[model samples]
Target: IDIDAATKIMCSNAKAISLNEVEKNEIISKYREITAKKSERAELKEVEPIPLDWPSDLTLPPLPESTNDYVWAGKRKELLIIDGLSIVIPTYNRAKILAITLACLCNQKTIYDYEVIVADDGSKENIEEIVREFESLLNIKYVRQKDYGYQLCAVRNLGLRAAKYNYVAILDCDMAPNPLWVQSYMELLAVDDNVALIGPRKYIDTSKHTYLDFLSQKSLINEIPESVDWRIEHFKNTDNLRLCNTPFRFFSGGNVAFAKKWLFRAGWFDEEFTHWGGEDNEFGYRLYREGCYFRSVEGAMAYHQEPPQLLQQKVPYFYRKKEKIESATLKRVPLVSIYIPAYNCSKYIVRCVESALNQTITDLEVCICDDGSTDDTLRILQEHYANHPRVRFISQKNKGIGSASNTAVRLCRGFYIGQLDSDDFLEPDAVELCLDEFRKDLSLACVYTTNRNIDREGNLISNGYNWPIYSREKLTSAMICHHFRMFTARAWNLTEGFNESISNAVDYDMYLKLSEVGPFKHINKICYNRVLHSIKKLDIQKENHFKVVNESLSRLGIKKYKYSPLTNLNECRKYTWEKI
Candidate 1:
């Protein structure tokens, strides 16, 4: 069985020293190598080129006045006046922008109670003087922290804790809020509890003089008009299901709202990170991992005064974090190396090496970095399989598969690499199919294949199904709807490779990381007949499926504690989660 299938079987049957253990150890070893070499670079095969028509730069288009009128009509008659809606604004040195933002908040038209909490990240400017100017006009609270350069996570954590109400809305100081921003977000919250943050798109001012503004305008202009229309059209009707059913990963750190309970359950962001870039993505990943819902409140908009590039990075760090979290949690494929620290596998060594040789795609190379295989497995390979051009047999002091895979990836000629379980067999077509897809989409950083479930007797119990086309919006939803068991066939070559820190299911974690680059394509073809004899589902050595599920969500920034069955089910039913 594949690692996930083996894990499921072991969890169900509660077996010991079974085949699952062997597979689990194989995966654990690979993870260890990736962790050890995270700082090192490895050759990666470029994935297939994306079709020329592949959608990019999708944005929210302008809705008609009639649409705006319709949204206004939907407003609640009794404005929700809770204790207060604490608006947390985090800023650095831009005091002029802060004044504009505060001015916008003070002029809000909501009948409900609200307050603005300005959490400054130690701006060098006199932000207190700016706050003092608005003190008489707005119910604003100000707090300052040591200048830690974009420690928004810490600042938000502080705001979430200090706020008096059950809800906390965050607005960056450079952002100007629309009059209905608070009311609109709160209305959506009233409909469901799973929404951790509600943000509006900040439109770039066309007439702005800054170079960054011009770049922002050019970028928006480049977006596929259809996607932009979809975002607005989806929000216009306001079908909570459709609005929340996004296939792409998106959450604006600059403007959004979250429930207090979500903050508590998400554990208030990982303090381990110390830079400007990844915190928002990490938090969003946590929400996805925890099964929280995200939405864009139509008509609730915000405008920011800063350069758009301030938040836009050229690299896919957010998606990279997604992979890191996933690698930390599940079975991942080997990247390039195949460090085999096996004591014995004489009976299966031939089958393992042969499977590696039989791969239909010729882009990969295998390094049988053997530590100490005491069995005839070494002799068998050297005697018969050694002549195969792709296999390289190397002797090493006893290390584990983790070390072997690491060693192999380092020796790989192609950028994309995959690890094969010593006892498992690959369908002849697995490599070709994954490579074909990757080849077709250059933007595709990774590829995975479907598999069939097999018994020790080589009998097929069930044929694995292919995955649906996934987008950022659909990824987490798909994870919750399906069991999230699409095998990547261990093929991907990118800047972010593997994480060895985790011992098991590192491939799965890598899949999560790949989400940052793009969603995994479900090839819909079963390319493997996973061996199940030695690795039955009942083995304790196998990781639990829930842990995998939870990790997938966590890496995606989902908040599981705040997951209400009613809301989740409703979302599922609305999106036809079963259909996904």
Candidate 2:
């Protein structure tokens, strides 16, 4: 199979796996064609866990290893000739702490050959001089990129570019790894090429520690520290992330490891993902989309010398990592793209965006357009959520709602296009359930879930704004799939997107045309909360509204139609069309 061939090529140990840009894309396309067909994973290929406190020249039994195989080096060398672990530490000016980290890593008891990459983000201190002192102790690569505040992603990439190993580990300057971290990581990843390993960590009081103390037997390993507990319960439920449907949701902000294929396959971290935004979260998502599996490696521990740098970045400023999300995830594509068309929806935008962000599914990005909102809609979004990772905003001149919706869909990162109203919100598991329906029935062109009607204060309205249960006859007569609609880009593109000709019945017109695309799946769950305010539109657009239904029926072999009025919070038109 081409997928196997591409995998073999990307993971080969040949002198050179030569390929041009076009060739790379061809290889990528071949794998993508098959990744789309992926389902539940089979059992993991388990192996013997390497026991602690053991160092030997003998490595594991013979098996096909990627590029440079991460092996037991047994002997020290001047140059790293075999594939081993590469530790990438991004630092600023913290020279001594970096020294302590190096000292700690050098003290590891394993015989595996590993390299260290210290990437500096425009520091004033002579970091290179400090790095030079460790040259005799370890294989070190020192590189730097000019600082743009704290562009951690760029620093990481700079460090990664210098790495020449099969397995790459990430660490912060203020943190040091346990003696077993390297061997434990290398051993676990050897189980599968798709593994993305996340390590454990505990905090330490920096005032009590120094580089000298970390150098020998007097190390902090002697001091017991408070372990991180946030993920404890989370892991308990997820079997350490090995048993979850969305396994890639967890990420170690600093302590993580990846088989080379995960990066080369999913692309590198985005330089635009500065600070805490999506540098870690979004990359996990991209790796998941690329068929990367994640495992929590408890033995592969790292110690925090002070306050967690990654968590501290969350408080100061909000970051938007759309560029990063689009970088690799968009390259492969998200499972679904939820788009919203906004016009003066300031009071409701936050709730709408929040509901989408809190989805059970991890593989989705929200795209919203402010359709020339004269109110504070865009302004509110800018000040509040400009740094949010999953949600992004754009503005355009007062385009009509139809045009706005078309624009929003065009920005989608997935082939599955889902629509949400700016004034409406979704249930937590709404998208996940819809995706489940699509997975079961591959021929479904669209999936629309049930809706619950609420007032401006989030109170359920009387009778919940009735729309008859889905039936071909009732659907032809009225708008049944109005609240939450999910459709493939293939279906949307194959037809004339949003019928620019319609005024008020834009969605109705589109739905009528799309019924021909393929079967629609209607799941009976209140997945959407649509706010029914005191607004009336039927008096004005009634003629145009029925024009959509009758015209659609005419093409489907219906000649004559009789219309009826349906009363709810707003008046709705229902038409029964029939052949003479």
Q: List, in order, the clash count of every candidate structure.
A: 89, 3
Q: Which pairs of residues clash in candidate 2, taking residues 3 or more apart in a chain or in different chains? A: 68-83, 319-387, 320-387
Q: Tally clashes: model 1.
A: 89
Off by over 4 Å in 2: 1-82, 222-229, 307-412, 415-580
Q: lDDT for model 1, on a 0 to 1 scale? A: 0.50
Worst 10 residues of 1 by lDDT: 59-68
- Quantify how close model 2 is to the true structure by its C-alpha RMSD in Å: 22.6
TM-scores, each model vs. reference: 0.43, 0.46
lDDT of each: 0.50, 0.65
- Kindly list the per-residue Cα lDDT of model 2 for residues 389-463, writing each as its tens digit: 556789998768788888888777664678898999887678777888876764456888767778999887742
Per-residue lDDT of candidate 1, residues 1-580 (tens digit)? 1222222232323343343556655644543442231111112233333322222432112211221122322331221334557788877767766776676676676766888888887788888888888788888888888886667778877766678887778788777776678888777666555555445554444233432332224333223121132344555465522333221245557777867677765556556456555556556645543335566666566665644321222112123221221122211212222222233666666555555444433224456655467766677657754654445676665555545555545554333445555665565446556556655553344555556666655676775543435444344333411121222222233213455444454544555555543445555555555555554443322334323432343433333222112223211322211110
